[PDB]
Amino acid sequence: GSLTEDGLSYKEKFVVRSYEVGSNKTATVETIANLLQEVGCNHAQSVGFSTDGFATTTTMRKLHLIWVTARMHIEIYKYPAWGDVVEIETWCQSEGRIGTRRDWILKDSVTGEVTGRATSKWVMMNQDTRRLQKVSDDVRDEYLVFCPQEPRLAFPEENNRSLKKIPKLEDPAQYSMIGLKPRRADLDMNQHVNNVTYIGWVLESIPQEIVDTHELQVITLDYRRECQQDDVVDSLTTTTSDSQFLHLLRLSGDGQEINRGTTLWRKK
Amino acid sequence: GSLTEDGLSYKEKFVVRSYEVGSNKTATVETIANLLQEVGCNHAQSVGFSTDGFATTTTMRKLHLIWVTARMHIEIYKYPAWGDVVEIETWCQSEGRIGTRRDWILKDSVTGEVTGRATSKWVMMNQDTRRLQKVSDDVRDEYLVFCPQEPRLAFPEENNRSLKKIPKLEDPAQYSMIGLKPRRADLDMNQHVNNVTYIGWVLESIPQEIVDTHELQVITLDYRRECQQDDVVDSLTTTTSNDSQFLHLLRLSGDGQEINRGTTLWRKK
Numbered sequence: 001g002s003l004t005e006d007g008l009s010y011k012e013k014f015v016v017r018s019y020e021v022g023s024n025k026t027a028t029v030e031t032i033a034n035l036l037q038e039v040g041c042n043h044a045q046s047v048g049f050s051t052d053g054f055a056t057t058t059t060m061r062k063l064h065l066i067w068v069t070a071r072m073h074i075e076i077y078k079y080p081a082w083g084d085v086v087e088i089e090t091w092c093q094s095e096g097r098i099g100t101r102r103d104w105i106l107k108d109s110v111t112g113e114v115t116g117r118a119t120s121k122w123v124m125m126n127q128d129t130r131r132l133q134k135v136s137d138d139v140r141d142e143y144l145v146f147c148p149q150e151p152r153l154a155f156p157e158e159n160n161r162s163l164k165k166i167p168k169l170e171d172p173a174q175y176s177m178i179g180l181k182p183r184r185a186d187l188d189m190n191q192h193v194n195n196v197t198y199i200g201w202v203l204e205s206i207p208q209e210i211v212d213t214h215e216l217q218v219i220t221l222d223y224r225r226e227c228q229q230d231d232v233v234d235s236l237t238t239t240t241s242d243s244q245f246l247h248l249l250r251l252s253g254d255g256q257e258i259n260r261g262t263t264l265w266r267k268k
Numbered sequence: 269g270s271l272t273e274d275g276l277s278y279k280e281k282f283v284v285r286s287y288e289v290g291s292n293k294t295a296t297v298e299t300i301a302n303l304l305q306e307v308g309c310n311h312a313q314s315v316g317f318s319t320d321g322f323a324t325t326t327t328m329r330k331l332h333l334i335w336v337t338a339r340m341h342i343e344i345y346k347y348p349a350w351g352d353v354v355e356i357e358t359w360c361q362s363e364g365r366i367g368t369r370r371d372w373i374l375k376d377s378v379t380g381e382v383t384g385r386a387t388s389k390w391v392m393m394n395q396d397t398r399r400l401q402k403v404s405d406d407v408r409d410e411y412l413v414f415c416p417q418e419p420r421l422a423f424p425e426e427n428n429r430s431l432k433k434i435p436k437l438e439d440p441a442q443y444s445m446i447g448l449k450p451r452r453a454d455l456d457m458n459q460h461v462n463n464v465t466y467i468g469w470v471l472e473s474i475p476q477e478i479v480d481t482h483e484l485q486v487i488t489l490d491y492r493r494e495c496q497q498d499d500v501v502d503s504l505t506t507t508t509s510n511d512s513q514f515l516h517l518l519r520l521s522g523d524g525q526e527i528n529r530g531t532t533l534w535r536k537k
Protein backbone atom coordinates (compact mmCIF):
# COMPACT_ATOMS: atom_id res chain seq x y z
CA GLY A 1 0.00 0.00 0.00
CA SER A 2 0.96 3.64 -0.46
CA LEU A 3 -0.10 7.25 0.06
CA THR A 4 -1.08 8.91 -3.23
CA GLU A 5 1.06 11.66 -4.88
CA ASP A 6 -0.68 14.53 -3.01
CA GLY A 7 -0.34 12.65 0.35
CA LEU A 8 -4.10 13.17 1.07
CA SER A 9 -5.42 9.58 0.45
CA TYR A 10 -4.07 5.99 0.64
CA LYS A 11 -4.44 2.95 -1.65
CA GLU A 12 -3.87 -0.73 -1.05
CA LYS A 13 -4.46 -3.95 -3.04
CA PHE A 14 -5.71 -7.21 -1.42
CA VAL A 15 -5.84 -10.72 -2.94
CA VAL A 16 -9.09 -12.37 -1.68
CA ARG A 17 -8.28 -15.48 0.44
CA SER A 18 -9.98 -18.92 0.40
CA TYR A 19 -11.34 -18.61 3.99
CA GLU A 20 -12.58 -15.04 3.29
CA VAL A 21 -15.36 -16.13 0.84
CA GLY A 22 -18.99 -17.37 1.34
CA SER A 23 -21.06 -19.93 -0.68
CA ASN A 24 -20.85 -17.88 -3.94
CA LYS A 25 -16.99 -18.02 -3.73
CA THR A 26 -16.99 -14.20 -3.33
CA ALA A 27 -15.79 -12.14 -0.30
CA THR A 28 -18.29 -11.87 2.61
CA VAL A 29 -19.37 -8.36 3.78
CA GLU A 30 -17.35 -9.07 7.03
CA THR A 31 -14.21 -9.73 4.90
CA ILE A 32 -14.88 -6.37 3.14
CA ALA A 33 -15.31 -4.57 6.53
CA ASN A 34 -12.04 -6.15 7.81
CA LEU A 35 -10.19 -4.88 4.66
CA LEU A 36 -11.69 -1.35 5.17
CA GLN A 37 -10.32 -1.43 8.74
CA GLU A 38 -6.89 -2.65 7.52
CA VAL A 39 -6.49 0.04 4.82
CA GLY A 40 -7.60 2.65 7.43
CA CYS A 41 -4.92 1.44 9.86
CA ASN A 42 -2.21 1.44 7.14
CA HIS A 43 -3.23 5.00 6.13
CA ALA A 44 -2.82 6.17 9.81
CA GLN A 45 0.64 4.43 9.95
CA SER A 46 1.75 6.01 6.67
CA VAL A 47 1.11 9.55 8.01
CA GLY A 48 3.16 9.06 11.18
CA PHE A 49 0.61 7.81 13.74
CA SER A 50 2.00 5.31 16.25
CA THR A 51 1.01 1.64 16.73
CA ASP A 52 -0.13 2.54 20.33
CA GLY A 53 -3.80 3.27 19.50
CA PHE A 54 -5.63 4.09 16.25
CA ALA A 55 -4.90 7.46 14.66
CA THR A 56 -4.25 9.22 18.00
CA THR A 57 -1.95 12.21 17.96
CA THR A 58 0.44 12.78 20.93
CA THR A 59 -2.03 15.47 22.25
CA MET A 60 -4.99 12.99 22.20
CA ARG A 61 -2.80 10.31 23.84
CA LYS A 62 -1.83 12.79 26.61
CA LEU A 63 -5.54 13.56 27.20
CA HIS A 64 -6.53 9.83 27.08
CA LEU A 65 -8.75 10.43 24.04
CA ILE A 66 -9.51 7.89 21.29
CA TRP A 67 -11.52 7.74 18.05
CA VAL A 68 -14.69 5.65 18.20
CA THR A 69 -17.05 4.63 15.34
CA ALA A 70 -20.61 6.05 15.60
CA ARG A 71 -21.80 4.73 12.16
CA MET A 72 -20.63 2.44 9.28
CA HIS A 73 -22.37 2.44 5.85
CA ILE A 74 -21.23 0.04 3.09
CA GLU A 75 -22.63 -0.33 -0.47
CA ILE A 76 -21.34 -3.22 -2.62
CA TYR A 77 -22.13 -3.56 -6.35
CA LYS A 78 -19.95 -6.68 -6.90
CA TYR A 79 -18.15 -8.79 -4.27
CA PRO A 80 -14.65 -9.83 -5.38
CA ALA A 81 -14.12 -13.51 -6.10
CA TRP A 82 -11.58 -15.78 -4.37
CA GLY A 83 -8.12 -14.98 -5.86
CA ASP A 84 -9.24 -11.63 -7.36
CA VAL A 85 -7.38 -8.43 -6.51
CA VAL A 86 -9.45 -5.58 -5.06
CA GLU A 87 -7.92 -2.07 -4.77
CA ILE A 88 -9.19 0.17 -2.01
CA GLU A 89 -8.64 3.94 -1.69
CA THR A 90 -9.39 5.72 1.63
CA TRP A 91 -9.29 9.28 2.97
CA CYS A 92 -10.64 11.33 5.96
CA GLN A 93 -12.37 14.67 6.26
CA SER A 94 -13.27 16.86 9.25
CA GLU A 95 -16.99 17.56 9.73
CA GLY A 96 -16.42 20.47 12.17
CA ARG A 97 -16.33 19.89 15.95
CA ILE A 98 -18.81 16.95 15.79
CA GLY A 99 -16.29 14.50 14.34
CA THR A 100 -14.49 13.01 11.37
CA ARG A 101 -15.57 10.98 8.39
CA ARG A 102 -13.47 8.20 6.80
CA ASP A 103 -14.55 7.24 3.22
CA TRP A 104 -13.51 4.33 1.00
CA ILE A 105 -13.80 3.38 -2.70
CA LEU A 106 -13.34 -0.26 -3.80
CA LYS A 107 -12.29 -1.12 -7.38
CA ASP A 108 -11.73 -4.20 -9.53
CA SER A 109 -7.92 -4.05 -10.09
CA VAL A 110 -8.13 -5.45 -13.63
CA THR A 111 -10.95 -3.31 -15.07
CA GLY A 112 -10.64 -0.24 -12.81
CA GLU A 113 -14.46 -0.32 -12.28
CA VAL A 114 -15.87 0.84 -8.91
CA THR A 115 -17.25 -2.32 -7.19
CA GLY A 116 -18.21 -0.71 -3.85
CA ARG A 117 -18.04 2.33 -1.57
CA ALA A 118 -18.21 3.03 2.16
CA THR A 119 -18.41 5.84 4.70
CA SER A 120 -18.07 6.03 8.48
CA LYS A 121 -18.51 8.67 11.22
CA TRP A 122 -16.03 8.84 14.10
CA VAL A 123 -16.15 10.85 17.37
CA MET A 124 -13.54 11.63 20.06
CA MET A 125 -14.20 9.91 23.40
CA ASN A 126 -12.21 9.75 26.67
CA GLN A 127 -10.97 6.09 26.84
CA ASP A 128 -11.45 5.93 30.63
CA THR A 129 -14.82 7.66 31.26
CA ARG A 130 -16.44 6.90 27.84
CA ARG A 131 -17.55 10.60 27.66
CA LEU A 132 -17.50 12.71 24.49
CA GLN A 133 -15.78 15.55 26.53
CA LYS A 134 -14.81 19.18 25.60
CA VAL A 135 -11.50 19.00 23.68
CA SER A 136 -10.47 22.38 22.01
CA ASP A 137 -9.21 23.32 18.48
CA ASP A 138 -5.51 22.51 19.05
CA VAL A 139 -6.33 18.74 18.68
CA ARG A 140 -8.12 19.17 15.29
CA ASP A 141 -5.28 21.38 13.94
CA GLU A 142 -3.03 18.35 14.21
CA TYR A 143 -5.28 16.28 11.84
CA LEU A 144 -6.24 18.90 9.21
CA VAL A 145 -2.87 18.61 7.39
CA PHE A 146 -3.64 14.95 6.51
CA CYS A 147 -7.13 15.61 5.00
CA PRO A 148 -8.23 17.19 1.73
CA GLN A 149 -9.76 20.66 2.20
CA GLU A 150 -12.33 20.67 -0.66
CA PRO A 151 -15.25 18.25 0.04
CA ARG A 152 -14.53 14.74 -1.28
CA LEU A 153 -17.48 12.43 -0.63
CA ALA A 154 -17.89 8.75 -1.46
CA PHE A 155 -21.71 9.55 -1.12
CA PRO A 156 -21.92 13.22 -2.23
CA GLU A 157 -25.72 13.60 -2.70
CA GLU A 158 -27.67 15.64 -0.08
CA ASN A 159 -29.93 13.32 2.08
CA ASN A 160 -28.48 10.02 0.69
CA ARG A 161 -28.84 6.51 2.35
CA SER A 162 -25.65 6.94 4.46
CA LEU A 163 -27.16 9.84 6.45
CA LYS A 164 -30.72 8.49 7.03
CA LYS A 165 -32.08 8.18 10.60
CA ILE A 166 -32.65 4.54 11.70
CA PRO A 167 -35.75 3.85 13.87
CA LYS A 168 -35.88 1.42 16.84
CA LEU A 169 -37.29 -2.06 16.09
CA GLU A 170 -40.38 -2.76 18.25
CA ASP A 171 -41.14 -6.22 19.70
CA PRO A 172 -42.14 -8.80 18.56
CA ALA A 173 -39.31 -9.09 15.97
CA GLN A 174 -40.02 -11.22 12.87
CA TYR A 175 -36.73 -13.14 13.28
CA SER A 176 -34.13 -13.49 16.05
CA MET A 177 -30.83 -15.18 17.00
CA ILE A 178 -30.40 -15.23 20.78
CA GLY A 179 -27.46 -15.75 23.10
CA LEU A 180 -24.63 -14.57 20.79
CA LYS A 181 -21.28 -14.22 22.66
CA PRO A 182 -17.84 -13.05 21.49
CA ARG A 183 -14.84 -15.39 21.62
CA ARG A 184 -11.09 -14.43 21.79
CA ALA A 185 -10.86 -14.17 17.92
CA ASP A 186 -13.54 -11.43 18.04
CA LEU A 187 -11.32 -9.17 20.21
CA ASP A 188 -8.85 -6.55 18.96
CA MET A 189 -5.28 -5.94 20.33
CA ASN A 190 -6.82 -3.89 23.23
CA GLN A 191 -9.27 -6.70 24.27
CA HIS A 192 -12.33 -4.81 22.92
CA VAL A 193 -14.88 -6.47 20.58
CA ASN A 194 -13.84 -5.66 16.99
CA ASN A 195 -16.41 -3.48 15.09
CA VAL A 196 -16.84 -6.11 12.36
CA THR A 197 -18.22 -8.64 14.93
CA TYR A 198 -21.38 -6.49 15.36
CA ILE A 199 -21.96 -6.67 11.55
CA GLY A 200 -21.77 -10.48 11.77
CA TRP A 201 -24.18 -10.50 14.76
CA VAL A 202 -26.68 -8.29 12.89
CA LEU A 203 -26.61 -10.65 9.89
CA GLU A 204 -27.11 -13.77 12.12
CA SER A 205 -30.89 -13.11 12.32
CA ILE A 206 -31.36 -12.84 8.48
CA PRO A 207 -33.20 -16.03 7.36
CA GLN A 208 -31.13 -18.68 5.51
CA GLU A 209 -33.60 -18.46 2.55
CA ILE A 210 -32.64 -14.79 2.03
CA VAL A 211 -28.86 -15.47 2.21
CA ASP A 212 -29.32 -18.36 -0.30
CA THR A 213 -31.34 -16.30 -2.89
CA HIS A 214 -30.15 -12.70 -2.43
CA GLU A 215 -26.97 -10.65 -2.31
CA LEU A 216 -26.42 -7.95 0.32
CA GLN A 217 -26.36 -4.56 -1.40
CA VAL A 218 -26.38 -2.03 1.46
CA ILE A 219 -25.76 -2.15 5.24
CA THR A 220 -25.99 0.90 7.56
CA LEU A 221 -25.09 0.29 11.23
CA ASP A 222 -25.19 2.70 14.20
CA TYR A 223 -22.95 1.88 17.24
CA ARG A 224 -24.46 3.02 20.58
CA ARG A 225 -22.72 0.95 23.26
CA GLU A 226 -20.03 -1.74 23.32
CA CYS A 227 -20.58 -5.43 24.07
CA GLN A 228 -18.10 -6.29 26.88
CA GLN A 229 -16.16 -9.60 26.60
CA ASP A 230 -18.65 -11.09 29.19
CA ASP A 231 -21.95 -9.65 27.77
CA VAL A 232 -24.48 -11.76 25.76
CA VAL A 233 -26.30 -10.34 22.72
CA ASP A 234 -29.70 -10.91 20.98
CA SER A 235 -29.96 -10.13 17.27
CA LEU A 236 -33.47 -9.06 16.06
CA THR A 237 -34.64 -8.46 12.45
CA THR A 238 -38.00 -7.43 10.87
CA THR A 239 -38.77 -7.14 7.13
CA THR A 240 -39.71 -3.53 6.24
CA SER A 241 -40.22 -3.99 2.45
CA ASP A 242 -35.60 -5.99 -3.31
CA SER A 243 -35.88 -7.03 0.38
CA GLN A 244 -35.21 -4.51 3.21
CA PHE A 245 -34.84 -5.21 6.92
CA LEU A 246 -34.62 -3.24 10.18
CA HIS A 247 -32.16 -4.63 12.77
CA LEU A 248 -31.55 -4.28 16.49
CA LEU A 249 -28.75 -5.76 18.72
CA ARG A 250 -29.40 -5.62 22.46
CA LEU A 251 -27.94 -7.19 25.63
CA SER A 252 -29.75 -10.52 26.42
CA GLY A 253 -30.77 -9.55 29.90
CA ASP A 254 -32.15 -6.07 30.40
CA GLY A 255 -32.49 -5.31 26.67
CA GLN A 256 -29.95 -2.45 26.55
CA GLU A 257 -29.42 -1.37 22.89
CA ILE A 258 -25.89 -1.80 21.52
CA ASN A 259 -26.58 -1.29 17.75
CA ARG A 260 -29.37 -0.55 15.26
CA GLY A 261 -29.23 -0.87 11.48
CA THR A 262 -30.84 -1.59 8.15
CA THR A 263 -29.92 -3.90 5.23
CA LEU A 264 -31.01 -3.90 1.55
CA TRP A 265 -30.78 -7.14 -0.49
CA ARG A 266 -31.24 -7.81 -4.21
CA LYS A 267 -32.39 -11.12 -5.76
CA LYS A 268 -29.47 -13.12 -7.27
CA GLY B 269 3.08 -17.06 -3.99
CA SER B 270 4.85 -19.57 -6.20
CA LEU B 271 5.83 -23.21 -6.65
CA THR B 272 9.56 -23.77 -6.06
CA GLU B 273 12.03 -24.64 -8.88
CA ASP B 274 11.51 -28.44 -8.55
CA GLY B 275 7.66 -27.98 -8.49
CA LEU B 276 7.43 -30.15 -5.30
CA SER B 277 6.69 -27.40 -2.68
CA TYR B 278 5.05 -23.92 -2.59
CA LYS B 279 6.01 -20.65 -0.86
CA GLU B 280 4.00 -17.55 -0.06
CA LYS B 281 4.63 -14.31 1.89
CA PHE B 282 1.95 -12.67 4.10
CA VAL B 283 1.99 -9.19 5.71
CA VAL B 284 0.38 -9.53 9.19
CA ARG B 285 -2.81 -7.40 9.42
CA SER B 286 -4.01 -5.15 12.29
CA TYR B 287 -7.11 -7.30 13.05
CA GLU B 288 -5.00 -10.51 12.92
CA VAL B 289 -3.03 -9.77 16.14
CA GLY B 290 -3.74 -10.30 19.88
CA SER B 291 -2.78 -8.23 22.97
CA ASN B 292 1.01 -8.56 22.32
CA LYS B 293 0.54 -7.06 18.80
CA THR B 294 1.66 -10.42 17.31
CA ALA B 295 -0.40 -12.85 15.14
CA THR B 296 -2.82 -15.13 17.05
CA VAL B 297 -2.47 -18.94 16.60
CA GLU B 298 -5.87 -18.80 14.69
CA THR B 299 -4.35 -16.23 12.26
CA ILE B 300 -1.39 -18.66 11.78
CA ALA B 301 -3.80 -21.61 11.16
CA ASN B 302 -5.78 -19.49 8.63
CA LEU B 303 -2.48 -18.66 6.75
CA LEU B 304 -1.52 -22.41 6.76
CA GLN B 305 -4.92 -23.15 5.16
CA GLU B 306 -4.47 -20.35 2.59
CA VAL B 307 -0.95 -21.43 1.48
CA GLY B 308 -2.28 -25.05 1.27
CA CYS B 309 -5.13 -23.89 -1.01
CA ASN B 310 -2.79 -21.82 -3.22
CA HIS B 311 -0.44 -24.84 -3.51
CA ALA B 312 -3.40 -27.04 -4.73
CA GLN B 313 -4.39 -24.29 -7.27
CA SER B 314 -0.82 -23.96 -8.55
CA VAL B 315 -0.66 -27.69 -9.43
CA GLY B 316 -3.88 -27.67 -11.45
CA PHE B 317 -6.58 -28.57 -8.90
CA SER B 318 -9.92 -26.87 -9.47
CA THR B 319 -11.74 -24.37 -7.20
CA ASP B 320 -14.57 -27.04 -6.89
CA GLY B 321 -13.35 -28.65 -3.65
CA PHE B 322 -9.94 -28.82 -1.98
CA ALA B 323 -7.19 -30.77 -3.77
CA THR B 324 -9.69 -33.12 -5.35
CA THR B 325 -8.63 -34.87 -8.59
CA THR B 326 -11.28 -35.52 -11.31
CA THR B 327 -11.31 -39.26 -10.22
CA MET B 328 -12.03 -38.28 -6.55
CA ARG B 329 -14.72 -35.81 -7.69
CA LYS B 330 -16.39 -38.56 -9.83
CA LEU B 331 -16.42 -40.86 -6.76
CA HIS B 332 -17.68 -38.07 -4.41
CA LEU B 333 -14.51 -38.30 -2.29
CA ILE B 334 -12.91 -35.42 -0.34
CA TRP B 335 -9.87 -34.85 1.89
CA VAL B 336 -10.63 -34.36 5.56
CA THR B 337 -8.23 -33.35 8.42
CA ALA B 338 -7.73 -36.03 11.13
CA ARG B 339 -4.96 -34.07 13.06
CA MET B 340 -3.32 -30.59 13.13
CA HIS B 341 -0.05 -29.98 15.07
CA ILE B 342 1.51 -26.46 15.20
CA GLU B 343 4.68 -25.36 17.04
CA ILE B 344 5.51 -21.61 17.13
CA TYR B 345 8.86 -20.21 18.34
CA LYS B 346 8.04 -16.54 17.56
CA TYR B 347 4.70 -15.07 16.45
CA PRO B 348 5.11 -12.43 13.72
CA ALA B 349 4.30 -8.86 14.69
CA TRP B 350 1.68 -6.62 13.05
CA GLY B 351 3.17 -5.38 9.72
CA ASP B 352 5.92 -8.06 9.63
CA VAL B 353 6.26 -10.37 6.62
CA VAL B 354 6.14 -14.11 7.31
CA GLU B 355 7.14 -16.58 4.56
CA ILE B 356 5.53 -20.02 4.59
CA GLU B 357 6.67 -23.08 2.63
CA THR B 358 4.35 -26.13 2.31
CA TRP B 359 4.48 -29.59 0.72
CA CYS B 360 2.59 -32.97 0.90
CA GLN B 361 3.70 -36.57 1.22
CA SER B 362 1.85 -39.88 0.92
CA GLU B 363 1.92 -42.09 4.03
CA GLY B 364 0.75 -45.25 2.21
CA ARG B 365 -2.96 -46.16 1.97
CA ILE B 366 -3.79 -44.56 5.36
CA GLY B 367 -3.57 -40.98 4.05
CA THR B 368 -1.40 -38.00 3.31
CA ARG B 369 0.52 -35.49 5.34
CA ARG B 370 0.80 -31.75 4.61
CA ASP B 371 3.77 -30.00 6.31
CA TRP B 372 4.63 -26.31 6.69
CA ILE B 373 7.69 -24.23 7.69
CA LEU B 374 7.27 -20.57 8.74
CA LYS B 375 10.17 -18.10 8.45
CA ASP B 376 10.93 -14.48 9.31
CA SER B 377 11.26 -12.91 5.83
CA VAL B 378 14.00 -10.49 6.90
CA THR B 379 16.32 -12.85 8.83
CA GLY B 380 15.42 -16.16 7.16
CA GLU B 381 15.13 -17.76 10.65
CA VAL B 382 12.53 -20.55 11.16
CA THR B 383 9.82 -19.06 13.45
CA GLY B 384 7.42 -22.06 13.41
CA ARG B 385 6.49 -25.44 11.89
CA ALA B 386 3.33 -27.46 11.40
CA THR B 387 2.10 -30.87 10.27
CA SER B 388 -1.33 -32.32 9.49
CA LYS B 389 -2.80 -35.79 8.65
CA TRP B 390 -5.54 -36.04 6.01
CA VAL B 391 -7.77 -39.00 5.01
CA MET B 392 -10.10 -39.66 2.05
CA MET B 393 -13.79 -39.74 2.99
CA ASN B 394 -16.99 -40.10 0.91
CA GLN B 395 -18.59 -36.61 1.09
CA ASP B 396 -22.15 -38.07 1.25
CA THR B 397 -21.89 -41.07 3.64
CA ARG B 398 -18.93 -39.75 5.74
CA ARG B 399 -17.26 -43.21 5.41
CA LEU B 400 -13.53 -43.79 4.91
CA GLN B 401 -14.44 -46.38 2.21
CA LYS B 402 -12.37 -48.54 -0.20
CA VAL B 403 -10.56 -46.55 -2.91
CA SER B 404 -8.29 -48.01 -5.66
CA ASP B 405 -4.50 -47.23 -6.16
CA ASP B 406 -5.32 -45.24 -9.35
CA VAL B 407 -6.49 -42.31 -7.11
CA ARG B 408 -3.09 -42.11 -5.27
CA ASP B 409 -1.17 -42.36 -8.59
CA GLU B 410 -2.74 -39.05 -9.56
CA TYR B 411 -1.22 -37.28 -6.48
CA LEU B 412 2.26 -38.86 -6.33
CA VAL B 413 3.62 -36.62 -9.14
CA PHE B 414 3.08 -33.51 -6.97
CA CYS B 415 4.92 -34.86 -3.85
CA PRO B 416 8.61 -35.39 -3.12
CA GLN B 417 9.58 -39.08 -3.05
CA GLU B 418 12.40 -38.97 -0.43
CA PRO B 419 11.02 -38.34 3.10
CA ARG B 420 10.81 -34.62 3.93
CA LEU B 421 9.54 -34.05 7.47
CA ALA B 422 8.84 -30.78 9.29
CA PHE B 423 9.05 -32.95 12.48
CA PRO B 424 11.95 -35.41 12.13
CA GLU B 425 12.56 -36.05 15.94
CA GLU B 426 12.39 -39.74 17.14
CA ASN B 427 9.32 -39.78 19.49
CA ASN B 428 8.17 -36.31 18.42
CA ARG B 429 5.12 -34.55 19.90
CA SER B 430 3.24 -34.49 16.55
CA LEU B 431 2.57 -38.25 16.66
CA LYS B 432 1.74 -38.71 20.39
CA LYS B 433 -1.60 -40.31 21.40
CA ILE B 434 -4.01 -37.91 23.17
CA PRO B 435 -6.09 -39.35 26.06
CA LYS B 436 -9.76 -38.49 26.80
CA LEU B 437 -10.34 -35.82 29.49
CA GLU B 438 -12.36 -37.23 32.41
CA ASP B 439 -15.04 -35.18 34.24
CA PRO B 440 -14.96 -32.95 36.23
CA ALA B 441 -12.85 -30.64 34.01
CA GLN B 442 -10.76 -27.97 35.80
CA TYR B 443 -12.06 -25.22 33.44
CA SER B 444 -14.89 -24.97 30.90
CA MET B 445 -16.59 -22.61 28.40
CA ILE B 446 -20.17 -23.79 27.72
CA GLY B 447 -22.64 -23.14 24.92
CA LEU B 448 -20.26 -22.18 22.09
CA LYS B 449 -22.03 -21.90 18.69
CA PRO B 450 -20.70 -21.10 15.19
CA ARG B 451 -21.88 -18.04 13.30
CA ARG B 452 -21.89 -17.47 9.48
CA ALA B 453 -18.24 -16.14 9.54
CA ASP B 454 -17.14 -19.53 10.97
CA LEU B 455 -18.37 -21.37 7.85
CA ASP B 456 -16.37 -22.16 4.71
CA MET B 457 -17.62 -21.83 1.04
CA ASN B 458 -19.40 -25.25 1.42
CA GLN B 459 -21.29 -24.21 4.62
CA HIS B 460 -19.14 -26.46 6.86
CA VAL B 461 -17.49 -25.17 10.09
CA ASN B 462 -13.89 -24.03 9.22
CA ASN B 463 -11.21 -26.20 10.91
CA VAL B 464 -9.66 -23.13 12.57
CA THR B 465 -12.92 -22.47 14.53
CA TYR B 466 -12.30 -25.67 16.59
CA ILE B 467 -8.83 -24.31 17.56
CA GLY B 468 -10.52 -21.11 18.80
CA TRP B 469 -13.13 -23.15 20.74
CA VAL B 470 -10.41 -25.28 22.38
CA LEU B 471 -8.56 -22.12 23.50
CA GLU B 472 -11.78 -20.54 24.94
CA SER B 473 -11.48 -22.63 28.15
CA ILE B 474 -7.83 -21.59 28.87
CA PRO B 475 -7.92 -19.21 31.90
CA GLN B 476 -7.38 -15.49 31.18
CA GLU B 477 -4.40 -15.49 33.64
CA ILE B 478 -2.58 -18.01 31.41
CA VAL B 479 -3.24 -16.05 28.18
CA ASP B 480 -2.03 -12.84 29.94
CA THR B 481 1.27 -14.37 31.28
CA HIS B 482 2.20 -17.11 28.78
CA GLU B 483 2.69 -17.66 25.08
CA LEU B 484 1.28 -20.71 23.28
CA GLN B 485 4.20 -22.87 22.07
CA VAL B 486 2.51 -26.09 20.89
CA ILE B 487 -1.05 -27.18 19.99
CA THR B 488 -2.01 -30.72 18.81
CA LEU B 489 -5.67 -31.23 17.86
CA ASP B 490 -7.48 -34.43 16.74
CA TYR B 491 -10.72 -34.03 14.68
CA ARG B 492 -13.26 -36.83 15.32
CA ARG B 493 -16.62 -35.42 14.24
CA GLU B 494 -17.88 -32.18 12.74
CA CYS B 495 -19.96 -29.54 14.58
CA GLN B 496 -23.03 -28.95 12.36
CA GLN B 497 -24.16 -25.30 11.85
CA ASP B 498 -26.98 -25.99 14.44
CA ASP B 499 -24.94 -27.94 17.08
CA VAL B 500 -23.74 -26.38 20.41
CA VAL B 501 -20.27 -27.12 21.85
CA ASP B 502 -18.72 -27.28 25.33
CA SER B 503 -14.97 -26.64 25.67
CA LEU B 504 -13.25 -28.45 28.61
CA THR B 505 -9.63 -28.04 29.84
CA THR B 506 -7.57 -29.61 32.69
CA THR B 507 -3.96 -28.74 33.66
CA THR B 508 -1.70 -31.81 33.24
CA SER B 509 1.65 -30.20 34.26
CA ASN B 510 8.13 -22.92 34.09
CA ASP B 511 5.93 -24.55 31.35
CA SER B 512 2.14 -25.17 31.62
CA GLN B 513 0.47 -28.10 29.77
CA PHE B 514 -3.25 -28.77 29.33
CA LEU B 515 -5.52 -31.56 28.06
CA HIS B 516 -8.58 -30.42 26.07
CA LEU B 517 -11.91 -31.87 25.00
CA LEU B 518 -14.69 -30.40 22.77
CA ARG B 519 -18.04 -32.18 22.95
CA LEU B 520 -21.62 -31.46 21.85
CA SER B 521 -23.98 -30.20 24.64
CA GLY B 522 -26.73 -32.35 22.99
CA ASP B 523 -25.44 -35.61 24.67
CA GLY B 524 -21.66 -35.23 25.20
CA GLN B 525 -20.53 -36.67 21.83
CA GLU B 526 -16.78 -35.92 21.33
CA ILE B 527 -15.91 -33.69 18.36
CA ASN B 528 -12.19 -32.96 19.18
CA ARG B 529 -9.47 -33.72 21.72
CA GLY B 530 -6.12 -31.95 22.09
CA THR B 531 -3.22 -30.72 24.16
CA THR B 532 -1.49 -27.32 24.47
CA LEU B 533 1.97 -26.35 25.84
CA TRP B 534 2.59 -22.78 27.07
CA ARG B 535 5.79 -20.98 28.14
CA LYS B 536 5.99 -18.06 30.61
CA LYS B 537 6.45 -14.69 28.82
Ligand SMILES: Nc1nc2ccccc2s1
Nearest residue numbers: 028029030203211216452
Ligand atom coordinates in the same frame (compact mmCIF):
# COMPACT_ATOMS: atom_id res chain seq x y z
N1 LIG C 1 -22.12 -10.80 1.34
C1 LIG C 1 -22.50 -11.32 2.51
N2 LIG C 1 -21.71 -11.41 3.55
C2 LIG C 1 -22.40 -11.95 4.63
C3 LIG C 1 -21.87 -12.11 5.91
C4 LIG C 1 -22.66 -12.68 6.88
C5 LIG C 1 -23.97 -13.07 6.61
C6 LIG C 1 -24.53 -12.87 5.37
C7 LIG C 1 -23.73 -12.30 4.38
S1 LIG C 1 -24.13 -11.93 2.73
Ligand SMILES: Nc1nc2ccccc2s1
Nearest residue numbers: 043044055092100143146
Ligand atom coordinates in the same frame (compact mmCIF):
# COMPACT_ATOMS: atom_id res chain seq x y z
N1 LIG D 1 -9.05 11.64 12.38
C1 LIG D 1 -8.11 11.40 11.46
N2 LIG D 1 -7.29 10.36 11.47
C2 LIG D 1 -6.56 10.32 10.28
C3 LIG D 1 -5.72 9.28 9.89
C4 LIG D 1 -5.09 9.36 8.67
C5 LIG D 1 -5.29 10.45 7.82
C6 LIG D 1 -6.15 11.46 8.17
C7 LIG D 1 -6.76 11.40 9.42
S1 LIG D 1 -7.91 12.51 10.12
Ligand SMILES: Nc1nc2ccccc2s1
Nearest residue numbers: 184295296297298471484
Ligand atom coordinates in the same frame (compact mmCIF):
# COMPACT_ATOMS: atom_id res chain seq x y z
N1 LIG E 1 -1.05 -17.02 20.27
C1 LIG E 1 -2.31 -17.23 20.68
N2 LIG E 1 -3.33 -17.29 19.88
C2 LIG E 1 -4.51 -17.47 20.61
C3 LIG E 1 -5.78 -17.59 20.06
C4 LIG E 1 -6.85 -17.75 20.91
C5 LIG E 1 -6.68 -17.83 22.29
C6 LIG E 1 -5.43 -17.77 22.85
C7 LIG E 1 -4.34 -17.60 22.00
S1 LIG E 1 -2.65 -17.47 22.39
Ligand SMILES: Nc1nc2ccccc2s1
Nearest residue numbers: 311312323360368411414
Ligand atom coordinates in the same frame (compact mmCIF):
# COMPACT_ATOMS: atom_id res chain seq x y z
N1 LIG F 1 -3.28 -35.08 -1.33
C1 LIG F 1 -2.58 -34.15 -1.98
N2 LIG F 1 -3.05 -32.97 -2.33
C2 LIG F 1 -2.03 -32.18 -2.88
C3 LIG F 1 -2.14 -30.83 -3.20
C4 LIG F 1 -1.04 -30.18 -3.70
C5 LIG F 1 0.18 -30.82 -3.85
C6 LIG F 1 0.33 -32.14 -3.47
C7 LIG F 1 -0.79 -32.82 -3.01
S1 LIG F 1 -0.93 -34.47 -2.47
